[PDB]
Amino acid sequence: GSSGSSGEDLPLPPGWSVDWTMRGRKYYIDHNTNTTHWSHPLESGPSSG
């Protein structure tokens, strides 16, 4: 099935941007709050809609 809950490339909100570090980790950046998150912002308590 799924590798291991690595990610679902969910539709990031307006203002966010994902980037891979040298090592090879995927992190999401929030330009609205100026903060980073290892896991998707919608995955853990999205509270969007």
How many CB atoms sit inside 10 A of residue 16's CB? Answer: 18
Q: Find, among 32, 49, 4, 39, the residue nearest to 18 by Cα.
A: 39
Closest CA to 13 of 49, 43, 42: 42
Domain assignments of the chain as residue spans, ordered by start: 12-49
Q: 20: part of which helix (H) or strand (E)?
A: strand 16-20
Question: In the CATH scheme, what architecture does the domain 12-49 have?
Answer: Single Sheet (2.20)
Q: Provide the residue count of the chain.
A: 49
Question: Reduced to 3 states, what is the DSSP secondary structure of residue 19?
Answer: strand
Residues 6+ apart with CB under 8 A from 24: none
